[PDB]
């Protein structure tokens, strides 16, 4: 694997530690989130991000960060603010960018 893949695998491991329940581990299904696919146009999750690293689809750290932000923004769009998912998305968006900045 390439230096970028190694760095992104490291960032991904550290980001997933901030989601110990694995709420962001796999794509959101409509079965657990009614109507999700009809509301969220560009779904994202950590498992898809892992597959993109392995496929070498991220050509910059910026692209990886954009998928992480997309994942969090989706949760803050579909869910109401008084939900576990909204609250965690907001928390990990900020904490995750901080972690990747230094």
Ligand X SMILES: Cn1ccc2cc[nH]c2c1=O
Binding residues vs ligand X (CB under 6 A): 23-24, 28, 32-33, 75, 78-79, 85
The minimum distance between CB 82 and ligand X, in angstroms, equals 13
The minimum distance between CB 54 and ligand X, in angstroms, equals 22
Cβ proximity to ligand X, 32 vs 38, nearer residue: 32
Instruction: Look at the block and give the residue holding tokens 């190694």.
Output: 6
**Counting Cβ atoms within 10 Å, is residue 6 exposed (0-12), middle (13-18) or buried (19+)?**
exposed
Please state, in angstroms and rounded to a whole number, the distance separating the CA atoms of residues 53 and 41: 22
Cβ proximity to ligand X, 68 vs 78, nearer residue: 78
The minimum distance between CB 88 and ligand X, in angstroms, equals 8
Residues in Cβ contact with 32 at an 8 Å cutoff, skipping those fewer than 6 apart: none
């Amino acid at each position: 694997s390439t230096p970028i893949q190694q760095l992104l695998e490291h960032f991904l491991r550290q980001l997933q530690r901030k989601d110990p329940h694995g709420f962001f581990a796999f794509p959101v299904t409509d079965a657990i989130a009614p109507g999700y696919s009809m509301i969220i146009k560009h779904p994202m999750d950590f498992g898809t991000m892992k597959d993109k690293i392995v496929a070498n689809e991220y050509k910059s750290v910026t692209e990886f960060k954009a998928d992480f932000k997309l994942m969090c923004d989706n949760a803050m769009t579909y869910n109401r603010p008084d939900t576990v998912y909204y609250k965690l998305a907001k928390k990990i968006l900020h904490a995750g960018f901080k972690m990747m900045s230094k």
